[PDB]
Amino acid sequence: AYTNSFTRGVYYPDKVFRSSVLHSTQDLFLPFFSNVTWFHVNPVLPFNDGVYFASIEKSNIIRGWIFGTSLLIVNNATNVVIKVFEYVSQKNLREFVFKNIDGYFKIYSKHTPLPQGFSALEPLVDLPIGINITRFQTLLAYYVGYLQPRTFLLKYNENGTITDAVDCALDPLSETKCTLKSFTVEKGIYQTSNFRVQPTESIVRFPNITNLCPFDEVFNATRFASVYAWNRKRISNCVADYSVLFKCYGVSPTKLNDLCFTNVYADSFVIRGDEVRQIAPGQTGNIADYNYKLPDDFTGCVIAWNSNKLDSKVSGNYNYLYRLFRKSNLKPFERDISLRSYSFRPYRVVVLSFELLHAPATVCGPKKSTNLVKNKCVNFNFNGLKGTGVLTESNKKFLPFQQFGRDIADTTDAVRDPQTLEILDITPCSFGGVSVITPGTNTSNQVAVLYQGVNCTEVLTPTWRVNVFQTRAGCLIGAEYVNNSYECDIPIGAGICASYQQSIIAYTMSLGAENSVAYSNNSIAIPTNFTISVTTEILPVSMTKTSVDCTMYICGDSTECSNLLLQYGSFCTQLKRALTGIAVEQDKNTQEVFAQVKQIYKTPPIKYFGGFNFSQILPDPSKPSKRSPIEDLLFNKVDLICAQKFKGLTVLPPLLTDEMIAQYTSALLAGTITSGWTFGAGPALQIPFPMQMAYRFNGIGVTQNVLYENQKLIANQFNSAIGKIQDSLSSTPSALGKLQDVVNHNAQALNTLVKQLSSKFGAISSVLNDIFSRLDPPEAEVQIDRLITGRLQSLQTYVTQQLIRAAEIRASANLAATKMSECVLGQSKRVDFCGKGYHLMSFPQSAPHGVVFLHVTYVPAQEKNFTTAPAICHDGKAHFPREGVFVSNGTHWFVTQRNFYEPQIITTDNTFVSGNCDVVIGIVNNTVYD
Amino acid sequence: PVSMTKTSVDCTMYICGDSTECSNLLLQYGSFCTQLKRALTGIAVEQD
Numbered sequence A: 001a002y003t004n005s006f007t008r009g010v011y012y013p014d015k016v017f018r019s020s021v022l023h024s025t026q027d028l029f030l031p032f033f034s035n036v037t038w039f040h041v042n043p044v045l046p047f048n049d050g051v052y053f054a055s056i057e058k059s060n061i062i063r064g065w066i067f068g069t070s071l072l073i074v075n076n077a078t079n080v081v082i083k084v085f086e087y088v089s090q091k092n093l094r095e096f097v098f099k100n101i102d103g104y105f106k107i108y109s110k111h112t113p114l115p116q117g118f119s120a121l122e123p124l125v126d127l128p129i130g131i132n133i134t135r136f137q138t139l140l141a142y143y144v145g146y147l148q149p150r151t152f153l154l155k156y157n158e159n160g161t162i163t164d165a166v167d168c169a170l171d172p173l174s175e176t177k178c179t180l181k182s183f184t185v186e187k188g189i190y191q192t193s194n195f196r197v198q199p200t201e202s203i204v205r206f207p208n209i210t211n212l213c214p215f216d217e218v219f220n221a222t223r224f225a226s227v228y229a230w231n232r233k234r235i236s237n238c239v240a241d242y243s244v245l246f247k248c249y250g251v252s253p254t255k256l257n258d259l260c261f262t263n264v265y266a267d268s269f270v271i272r273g274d275e276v277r278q279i280a281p282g283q284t285g286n287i288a289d290y291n292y293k294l295p296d297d298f299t300g301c302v303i304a305w306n307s308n309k310l311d312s313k314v315s316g317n318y319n320y321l322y323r324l325f326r327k328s329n330l331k332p333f334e335r336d337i338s339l340r341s342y343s344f345r346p347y348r349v350v351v352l353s354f355e356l357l358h359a360p361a362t363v364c365g366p367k368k369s370t371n372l373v374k375n376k377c378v379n380f381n382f383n384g385l386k387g388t389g390v391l392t393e394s395n396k397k398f399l400p401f402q403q404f405g406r407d408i409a410d411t412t413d414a415v416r417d418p419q420t421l422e423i424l425d426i427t428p429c430s431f432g433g434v435s436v437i438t439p440g441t442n443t444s445n446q447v448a449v450l451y452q453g454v455n456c457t458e459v460l461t462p463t464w465r466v467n468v469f470q471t472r473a474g475c476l477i478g479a480e481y482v483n484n485s486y487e488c489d490i491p492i493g494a495g496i497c498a499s500y501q502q503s504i505i506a507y508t509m510s511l512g513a514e515n516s517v518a519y520s521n522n523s524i525a526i527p528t529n530f531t532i533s534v535t536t537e538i539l540p541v542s543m544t545k546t547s548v549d550c551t552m553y554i555c556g557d558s559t560e561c562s563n564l565l566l567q568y569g570s571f572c573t574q575l576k577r578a579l580t581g582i583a584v585e586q587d588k589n590t591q592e593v594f595a596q597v598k599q600i601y602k603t604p605p606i607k608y609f610g611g612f613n614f615s616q617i618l619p620d621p622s623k624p625s626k627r628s629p630i631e632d633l634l635f636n637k638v639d640l641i642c643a644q645k646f647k648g649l650t651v652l653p654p655l656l657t658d659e660m661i662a663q664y665t666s667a668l669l670a671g672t673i674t675s676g677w678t679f680g681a682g683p684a685l686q687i688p689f690p691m692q693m694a695y696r697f698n699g700i701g702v703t704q705n706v707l708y709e710n711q712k713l714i715a716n717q718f719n720s721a722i723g724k725i726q727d728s729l730s731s732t733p734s735a736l737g738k739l740q741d742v743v744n745h746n747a748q749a750l751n752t753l754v755k756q757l758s759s760k761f762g763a764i765s766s767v768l769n770d771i772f773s774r775l776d777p778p779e780a781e782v783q784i785d786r787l788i789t790g791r792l793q794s795l796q797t798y799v800t801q802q803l804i805r806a807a808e809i810r811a812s813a814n815l816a817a818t819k820m821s822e823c824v825l826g827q828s829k830r831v832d833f834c835g836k837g838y839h840l841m842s843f844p845q846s847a848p849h850g851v852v853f854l855h856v857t858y859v860p861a862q863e864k865n866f867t868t869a870p871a872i873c874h875d876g877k878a879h880f881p882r883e884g885v886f887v888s889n890g891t892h893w894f895v896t897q898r899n900f901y902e903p904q905i906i907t908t909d910n911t912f913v914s915g916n917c918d919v920v921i922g923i924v925n926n927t928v929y930d
Numbered sequence B: 001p002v003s004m005t006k007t008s009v010d011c012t013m014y015i016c017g018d019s020t021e022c023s024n025l026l027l028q029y030g031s032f033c034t035q036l037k038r039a040l041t042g043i044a045v046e047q048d
């Protein structure tokens, strides 16, 4: 019988209290939705890595368990009895988790008065036992599941209770949740992991020679050569079994059976005891200078054993001579047989040298050999060259002295088979990135998966599996390709986007609606109306000013680390200097954006401006902050601090307060409302607002009367647009994404810096006191230096990224200052610099870390077709319009301004004469009234 | 110039490249590869 484990089996991984957080734990868990064995009410079940044991009964039928390949637990009303050591202490679902880790036996449990719910198991007992549990059996409907190494994302409420968990490896959505460290996923595409084709078989290819090497002749020879004339023997074409046989250089003896050698030579002699220390690289002495000198870069093994009952003589042996005088010290592996005696009375040394650097293998250890598997991802081993990949028949042309082929990275990419002598390419097994496309968990749990840079024929590391489509970006699984084209929702790549239609669809993105302009050589479209448009532009100006405490981040009130940290010195001095430069740059950015005017202009008491209503951008006196309603909305629209501060990371306040920035903004607004563009170029010259509007209409080539004749309509359009600004900002949550992105970048950088303190950087632990109170001080300094270099590197990376982000923010602030000068303090002719349309004016509003420009532009509307001519022929003279264009109803001919239909009688006062009617192409006969 | 090549790096494959022992050792160096992946993803998005 089998059942679903649902989301049961979660226990508390430690004794730590965590409050209202999400924590990631690697531990032995019961995988979600596992297949759990079911029993009704006693087989002997295995104990693989720990056990989840649940039961649903109302009669206490189950009583205990016996653990062993011994340990016994019985739950009796008197006490629960544990016996191996001894210990004594103490329908409804009862769940237990049994683990045997690090010599300790741990039991977690819970009781609930399988169900489709979540309930964590609190720890029950920990016992020092020490036995090797391999099987277990219950003692008396119970369910059994098995633990596996897994990463879980557990959520702790404010009470420290685990209320939910995510099994990261269960499915793509869970992997995305674990990647984002949240239970909620916004719509988008997320790089989650890498897929890698896993090897199927392990192949071994060693030479077929099965003869054993003549080691015994070297070692068991009755007499050994004298050290001055040491013997050298070549080992070739044999199996070297080192178990028959010890200081090894460049290799470990316990691994010597697993490697292939090429130039192996045994050098044998007999020496006098202590000079054993002189058979070594670099060593000096009589033997190491005049008899036997090893290379500085010597790899191989020196094996020496005392031969007392082999060579000792009661009279003094004279068979072993040595060179006691010489001109100059020998070169490595150089012999001189051109001399004293030891006179041994009541040590044989052999030096094995070999080359492990590629080359054909002449001597190989005993490893057996298997078949040669091709076209499949396998773990291969060619003469000691281990690896994983696909082996294919080659078109390369090797040479007899060549055994391996190498690529740019000095990586072996082609190999000659030791037996068949064929050449094989080695490619790595197929792999790539994996992206998850989600419409958002608030919408659906449905996902699509993109395997990047890989076609669908080879689509494993993610261990989950998942409406198959091929794109230049890779293989898309879980999305249906539709022939319709929509605006891009989730970008996939190469023109392919994804969207949530009930289902996930992939499509070719559209660039917009096709449009054809009715072009002809004599037709012109002229607007007859206009719309006053007010658009919003949001610009970051400054970032958070950050300061870092050197020792508090690196050491954290540890004195040995603090004393060790002064061996670098200039590092964090320059780090603090860079951060201080960034902070003063932030204050400079704010100053250059908002302090353009030196007078603080006040808005007049009476707030009549010819029908224009500025109440939503002017300061609101009732509110204590004196902010405008739109500024109020902006500032509402955008314990961790203390925790970061306790690690040396603090935030400095900006020099200008939000109130002072609001004062600057209100001064700019009052200046522009009461004096137009004059206060930017000199003394503020007052002018009625309708007259300033007429000036700005003249700026964009529209005559003044157009605004005076449409004053009420223009004011109403402006008021309506300003009122819609509030709704557009408030309804849209993504409106202020730039400033929030600045805030989130700062927060993410700080969080990364904080979480790098748990990084060990390859040391025993990430805690200094553990290293200092559990290790020799000579090695404690080494490991603490490892940690210190890691943390200093983290700080330097943080500062470098802060400098790059500060440069980007400085560019943004320079652009904002330019827009303040050119869009707020004047009227700009630069296309699209101050909003879409013909710029009229702009109003600044302060925002938490930036500025918001409200651009008021003139957009032509209600265009009409007319027939046009370059010139009008009259009295043999060509007339060209002075400040307009010639248009026609169809019968009569007028002249009009270009951006607003205002037909006028063609007179000699709105045209000018140039030449006859013989050169201009398209000239039209008509009357020019005088 | 308007954009540059969008690059992605498989941190483990570059550093270790089929060596599982190297991967286990590399898992002890923290979120280095996570930071690099985030930075490169930001660059790639900025190109588009």
Ligand SMILES: *[C@@H]1O[C@H](CO)[C@@H](O)[C@H](O)[C@H]1NC(C)=O
Pocket (backbone or CB within 6 Å): A455, A456, A457
């Ligand atoms: C993937 O394999 C299919 C089938 O052989 C092939 O048509 C396709 O071109 C391959 N992908 C690429 C990128 O070449």
Ligand SMILES: *[C@@H]1O[C@H](CO)[C@@H](O)[C@H](O)[C@H]1NC(C)=O
Pocket (backbone or CB within 6 Å): A519, A520, A521
């Ligand atoms: C002017 O446009 C018309 C229609 O678009 C075309 O037939 C005519 O050839 C054009 N004029 C000249 C000189 O080509």
Ligand SMILES: *[C@@H]1O[C@H](CO)[C@@H](O)[C@H](O)[C@H]1NC(C)=O
Pocket (backbone or CB within 6 Å): A528, A529, A530, A531, A717, A862
């Ligand atoms: C211009 O458009 C406005 C709406 O913005 C409308 O009330 C007005 O009647 C229009 N005028 C003309 C001449 O079409």
Ligand SMILES: *[C@@H]1O[C@H](CO)[C@@H](O)[C@H](O)[C@H]1NC(C)=O
Pocket (backbone or CB within 6 Å): A613, A614, A615, A616, A723
């Ligand atoms: C200006 O607009 C606000 C908001 O729409 C409104 O409450 C106020 O009465 C208006 N003032 C005038 C003078 O129309």
Ligand SMILES: *[C@@H]1O[C@H](CO)[C@@H](O)[C@H](O)[C@H]1NC(C)=O
Pocket (backbone or CB within 6 Å): A518, A525, A863, A864, A865
């Ligand atoms: C101008 O004429 C073209 C072709 O006759 C037509 O497609 C277009 O809609 C006209 N424009 C207006 C504003 O009516």
Ligand SMILES: *[C@@H]1O[C@H](CO)[C@@H](O)[C@H](O)[C@H]1NC(C)=O
Pocket (backbone or CB within 6 Å): A889, A890, A891, A892
């Ligand atoms: C031509 O313009 C005059 C305006 O003075 C008037 O007859 C009419 O608006 C136009 N004719 C036609 C057919 O539209």
Ligand SMILES: *[C@@H]1O[C@H](CO)[C@@H](O)[C@H](O)[C@H]1NC(C)=O
Pocket (backbone or CB within 6 Å): A873, A925
């Ligand atoms: C315009 O007038 C001139 C001379 O008066 C004549 O030659 C020409 O043909 C006229 N244009 C048209 C389109 O009739």
